[PDB]
Each structure stands twice: as structure tokens, then as C-alpha cells.
Scaffold this active site. Sequence first.
Site, PDB file in Angstrom:
ATOM      1  N   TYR A  45       2.353   4.004  -4.145  1.00  0.00           N
ATOM      2  CA  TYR A  45       2.234   3.025  -4.423  1.00  0.00           C
ATOM      3  C   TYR A  45       3.338   3.035  -5.377  1.00  0.00           C
ATOM      4  O   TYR A  45       3.530   4.053  -6.570  1.00  0.00           O
ATOM      5  CB  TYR A  45       1.804   2.261  -4.584  1.00  0.00           C
ATOM      6  N   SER A  91      -5.036  -5.590   4.242  1.00  0.00           N
ATOM      7  CA  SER A  91      -4.328  -5.501   5.442  1.00  0.00           C
ATOM      8  C   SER A  91      -4.372  -7.255   6.115  1.00  0.00           C
ATOM      9  O   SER A  91      -4.373  -7.730   7.512  1.00  0.00           O
ATOM     10  CB  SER A  91      -2.327  -5.287   6.358  1.00  0.00           C
ATOM     11  N   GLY A 124      -2.648  -9.258   7.836  1.00  0.00           N
ATOM     12  CA  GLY A 124      -0.750  -8.428   8.737  1.00  0.00           C
ATOM     13  C   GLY A 124       0.640  -8.239   7.491  1.00  0.00           C
ATOM     14  O   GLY A 124       1.301  -9.075   8.472  1.00  0.00           O
ATOM     15  N   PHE A 125      -0.140  -8.200   6.689  1.00  0.00           N
ATOM     16  CA  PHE A 125       1.485  -8.101   5.804  1.00  0.00           C
ATOM     17  C   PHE A 125       1.953  -9.390   5.455  1.00  0.00           C
ATOM     18  O   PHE A 125       2.655  -9.637   4.746  1.00  0.00           O
ATOM     19  CB  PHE A 125       1.783  -7.685   6.453  1.00  0.00           C
ATOM     20  N   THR A 179       2.057 -11.869   7.742  1.00  0.00           N
ATOM     21  CA  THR A 179       2.065 -12.456   9.191  1.00  0.00           C
ATOM     22  C   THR A 179       1.645 -14.328   9.398  1.00  0.00           C
ATOM     23  O   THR A 179       1.431 -15.254   9.780  1.00  0.00           O
ATOM     24  CB  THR A 179       2.693 -12.222  10.585  1.00  0.00           C
ATOM     25  N   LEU A 180       0.026 -13.627   9.376  1.00  0.00           N
ATOM     26  CA  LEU A 180      -1.220 -15.079   9.414  1.00  0.00           C
ATOM     27  C   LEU A 180      -0.685 -16.249   8.414  1.00  0.00           C
ATOM     28  O   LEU A 180      -1.953 -16.967   9.163  1.00  0.00           O
ATOM     29  CB  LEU A 180      -2.229 -14.230   9.520  1.00  0.00           C
ATOM     30  N   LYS A 196       4.268 -17.723   8.151  1.00  0.00           N
ATOM     31  CA  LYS A 196       5.772 -17.762   7.741  1.00  0.00           C
ATOM     32  C   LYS A 196       6.534 -17.456   7.978  1.00  0.00           C
ATOM     33  O   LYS A 196       7.403 -17.535   7.635  1.00  0.00           O
ATOM     34  CB  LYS A 196       5.446 -17.011   5.938  1.00  0.00           C
TER      35      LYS A 196
HETATM   36  N1  NDP Z   1      -5.344   2.396   3.228  1.00  0.00           N
HETATM   37  C1  NDP Z   1      -4.178   1.743   3.217  1.00  0.00           C
HETATM   38  O1  NDP Z   1      -3.853   2.665   4.097  1.00  0.00           O
HETATM   39  C2  NDP Z   1      -3.635   0.705   2.823  1.00  0.00           C
HETATM   40  C3  NDP Z   1      -4.152   0.051   2.002  1.00  0.00           C
HETATM   41  N2  NDP Z   1      -3.796  -1.739   1.375  1.00  0.00           N
HETATM   42  C4  NDP Z   1      -5.032  -2.053   0.056  1.00  0.00           C
HETATM   43  O2  NDP Z   1      -5.076  -3.405   0.475  1.00  0.00           O
HETATM   44  C5  NDP Z   1      -4.082  -4.422  -0.263  1.00  0.00           C
HETATM   45  C6  NDP Z   1      -3.547  -5.427   0.865  1.00  0.00           C
HETATM   46  O3  NDP Z   1      -2.038  -4.859   2.097  1.00  0.00           O
HETATM   47  P1  NDP Z   1      -1.331  -6.118   2.177  1.00  0.00           P
HETATM   48  O4  NDP Z   1      -0.802  -5.407   3.067  1.00  0.00           O
HETATM   49  O5  NDP Z   1      -0.418  -6.879   0.996  1.00  0.00           O
HETATM   50  O6  NDP Z   1      -2.208  -7.383   3.071  1.00  0.00           O
HETATM   51  P2  NDP Z   1      -1.908  -8.818   3.768  1.00  0.00           P
HETATM   52  O7  NDP Z   1      -1.852  -8.151   4.709  1.00  0.00           O
HETATM   53  O8  NDP Z   1      -2.996  -9.508   3.412  1.00  0.00           O
HETATM   54  O9  NDP Z   1      -0.381  -9.140   3.211  1.00  0.00           O
HETATM   55  C7  NDP Z   1       0.147  -9.467   1.728  1.00  0.00           C
HETATM   56  C8  NDP Z   1       0.863 -10.334   1.585  1.00  0.00           C
HETATM   57  O10 NDP Z   1       1.102 -11.299   2.845  1.00  0.00           O
HETATM   58  C9  NDP Z   1       2.406 -12.693   1.039  1.00  0.00           C
HETATM   59  N3  NDP Z   1       0.940 -13.187   0.978  1.00  0.00           N
HETATM   60  C10 NDP Z   1       0.268 -12.838   0.566  1.00  0.00           C
HETATM   61  N4  NDP Z   1      -0.586 -14.550   0.812  1.00  0.00           N
HETATM   62  C11 NDP Z   1      -0.251 -15.674   0.507  1.00  0.00           C
HETATM   63  C12 NDP Z   1      -0.083 -16.273   1.117  1.00  0.00           C
HETATM   64  N5  NDP Z   1      -1.825 -16.714   0.886  1.00  0.00           N
HETATM   65  N6  NDP Z   1       0.387 -17.719   1.918  1.00  0.00           N
HETATM   66  C13 NDP Z   1       1.760 -16.818   1.706  1.00  0.00           C
HETATM   67  N7  NDP Z   1       2.522 -15.295   1.639  1.00  0.00           N
HETATM   68  C14 NDP Z   1       0.990 -14.658   1.139  1.00  0.00           C
HETATM   69  C15 NDP Z   1       2.062 -12.165   0.132  1.00  0.00           C
HETATM   70  O11 NDP Z   1       3.551 -10.856   0.475  1.00  0.00           O
HETATM   71  P3  NDP Z   1       5.026 -11.198   0.462  1.00  0.00           P
HETATM   72  O12 NDP Z   1       4.458 -12.331  -0.077  1.00  0.00           O
HETATM   73  O13 NDP Z   1       5.862 -10.345   0.686  1.00  0.00           O
HETATM   74  O14 NDP Z   1       5.435 -12.511   1.677  1.00  0.00           O
HETATM   75  C16 NDP Z   1       1.564 -10.274   0.431  1.00  0.00           C
HETATM   76  O15 NDP Z   1       2.305  -8.970  -0.343  1.00  0.00           O
HETATM   77  C17 NDP Z   1      -2.653  -3.653  -0.591  1.00  0.00           C
HETATM   78  O16 NDP Z   1      -1.939  -3.768  -1.771  1.00  0.00           O
HETATM   79  C18 NDP Z   1      -3.427  -2.005   0.171  1.00  0.00           C
HETATM   80  O17 NDP Z   1      -4.233  -1.636  -1.574  1.00  0.00           O
HETATM   81  C19 NDP Z   1      -2.436  -1.928   2.768  1.00  0.00           C
HETATM   82  C20 NDP Z   1      -1.974  -1.294   3.509  1.00  0.00           C
HETATM   83  C21 NDP Z   1      -2.520  -0.253   3.950  1.00  0.00           C
END
Ligand code: NDP
Length: 346
Positions: free
Chosen positions: A53, A234, A237-238, A240-241, A244
Site C-alpha cells: 500500500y 471492499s 464495492g470501492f 459504488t454501493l 455516487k
Molecule cells: N486483501 C485485499 O486484497 C484487499 C484489502 N482491502 C482492505 O479493505 C479496506 C477497504 O477497501 P475499499 O475498497 O477501500 O473499501 P470500500 O469498498 O468500502 O470503498 C471505500 C471507498 O469508498 C468511498 N467511500 C467510503 N465511504 C463512503 C461514504 N459513506 N460515502 C461516499 N463515499 C464513500 C471512499 O472512496 P472515494 O472517496 O475515493 O470515493 C473510500 O475510499 C482497504 O483499505 C484494505 O485495508 C481492500 C481491497 C483488497
Amino acid sequence: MQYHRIPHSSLEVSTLGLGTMTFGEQNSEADAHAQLDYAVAQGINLIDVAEMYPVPPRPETQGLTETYVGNWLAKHGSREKLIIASKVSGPSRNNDKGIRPDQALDRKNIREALHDSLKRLQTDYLDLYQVHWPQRPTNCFGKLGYSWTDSAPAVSLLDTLDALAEYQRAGKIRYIGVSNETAFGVMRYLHLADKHDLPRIVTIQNPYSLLNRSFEVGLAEVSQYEGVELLAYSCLGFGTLTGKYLNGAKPAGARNTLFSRFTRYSGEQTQKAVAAYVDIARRHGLDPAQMALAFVRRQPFVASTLLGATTMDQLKTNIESLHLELSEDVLAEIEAVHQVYTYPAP
Ligand SMILES: NC(=O)C1=CN([C@@H]2O[C@H](COP(=O)(O)OP(=O)(O)OC[C@H]3O[C@@H](n4cnc5c(N)ncnc54)[C@H](OP(=O)(O)O)[C@@H]3O)[C@@H](O)[C@H]2O)C=CC1
């Protein structure tokens, strides 16, 4: 905060954990420290990092996440109350640059990775060290079903488990976990622990959300009988859920707007499912992000949900999901959408 005891361990994890993969890219060090301070003030004890990371990964920033977390740990102290979970990379993949030459999950790579992680994190041990993805090609990272391979992998699960065992004995890692694994892989690691008197993995960190519930086909049953519990990732869904990106929107500063390489949750069927879930939320007066999170939290195989946030308001909303309990009617509507869009984003 609610907590969950992981079987075969001394870990009692907060039901929500703090993921960190944007720390060093979208987020600055001060943002990182503000999120870690807030999360701990709300009772979270699980912090998930990785040697690779932040994302999107590149050599220039590799390791910055762990370094930011270590810099925080050095200042805020009370280290012992935290569960710091990191990861060693699997073989280089997805055209991404490796961290080490001919990177593999063997003793030489694990020794180097672990020591470099401990140095950046400024601590003498990790509470959980995880195999970031398997050595062998399998159905993870966008592949729903398994495809037969011809090549036996270069390093076996026993090779990897034996190497980890050395560092657990040394006290450099308390517990070991896997990530992006499958039912076969988990059961093999468990078989080997018993057969060879080696440590037993205690967690699997896999994607789990409304858009990818495939953990339920083979792994949820392993979790019930064996106690290897899910650290879900996730769960939005990054993002997407949250809805936005609906109707062609590309909000400034959002992950998928800035980094168009992230396509895991952008497929045609996935986008239709997102619209359907957001619609359930809006009709039931729920925040779509909170509904998505509460759905994951209520699963009996989920020990913790790893949250992601790039702003403090996002993190506040996401932790507040703890208080949402989904109704029978919402659960049934979710099941109906999932029948139409089954595992759309593996
Ligand atoms: N083991 C593995 O292969 C993996 C591990 N991970 C772990 O899981 C953690 C979470 O994964 P991640 O994909 O970030 O999780 P999510 O699917 O929950 O996506 C989070 C992203 O969504 C946006 N967001 C979060 N909350 C809100 C909200 N309430 N309203 C609007 N936008 C929001 C922000 O992105 P933005 O503001 O840019 O829109 C944020 O970075 C990682 O940090 C890591 O520790 C993640 C992926 C793979």
C-alpha cells in the site's frame, strides 16, 4: 463499538476495522493520522495495512501506508491495545511492478517482507500477518469460478506455512491469516496445521459485499465448522454501493473518477445491481452506504468489516452504520435483487 472473539486466538476484534490503502495516495499523512485517531476514539482496534500500500500501487509510494501508520503508532502509544494486521505480497500480478525480484511466498521473501514491514510500522511484532494472495493461480481478483491450471505452483502451501511458523515462534507475528483464498486453500492450510503440528490460520480476508457474496458458496461453511473467520473487504464495492456513480456521474476526487484502472465494480451487471440496491435503500429511508455495511455486519461468518474512507465525514457515516439493523423487508428485497444479479462483481 461491538467486538468479536476470533476462535483459536487471543484476538477480540472490533466489529468494524480501519482499512488504510489510500494512505499515501489520495490521503496525506495528516489525513491518515486523523482517521486512525478517530477510529480508535470510536473503539476500533483492528488496523489493516500491507507492504504494497497505498493503491494504486507503484514503486515511488510503496510502503508509505505502513510508514504513516508506524509514525502514528510511535506518537500515540498504547500499541498493545491495537491489532495491527499486515500482509506479504503474493507473486507479482496484474502487470504491477514487484517489490522483490522473482517474488514468491517462500522463506526468503517472507523473511524480507516481514522485517521491512516491522521496520516501517515501528513495532517489534504484528498481531496478524496475512498471505496477500495465493502463489497458485485461482479464482480471486475478478474471477468467479476456478479454471484448471496446468503448471504446479513453485512454492506449496506447506512451504508458505512452514516459513510463517518460524516467525510466529520468534514472536514477530502473533497470528497468521490468508487473503483472496478459496475453500480448498483454507481447508488445505488447516489440514497441514494438524498433520504437521504447524500454526492454524485464523482469518481469511476476502471481498464481501452485496456485489460479491460468493464467499457463501464454499467458504461460509468452512467458517462455521473450522472457525476461520472473514475479515471482509471492499464492502462498498470501492464506493459504488454509495450510489455516487449512478447515471454517469463522476464526482471529483472519487476513486473511480481519479483512477479509471479500478474496474472491479464497474461491469454492466454490477452497475445494474448497484442501481437496484440504492433503490432499496432510498425507498426504506436508509443511507445506501450504511445499508451495504449493515448487510455485511450481520453475517455470522464476518468477524470484522474493513472500512475504507478518504474523508472524515465518510468515516463518521461508515462507523455509524453500527447502529443500523436491517428489517425483514429490506433483507427480502436484497435477496430478490441478488437472484437477478448473482455475484456480479467477483
Ligand atoms: N486483501 C485485499 O486484497 C484487499 C484489502 N482491502 C482492505 O479493505 C479496506 C477497504 O477497501 P475499499 O475498497 O477501500 O473499501 P470500500 O469498498 O468500502 O470503498 C471505500 C471507498 O469508498 C468511498 N467511500 C467510503 N465511504 C463512503 C461514504 N459513506 N460515502 C461516499 N463515499 C464513500 C471512499 O472512496 P472515494 O472517496 O475515493 O470515493 C473510500 O475510499 C482497504 O483499505 C484494505 O485495508 C481492500 C481491497 C483488497
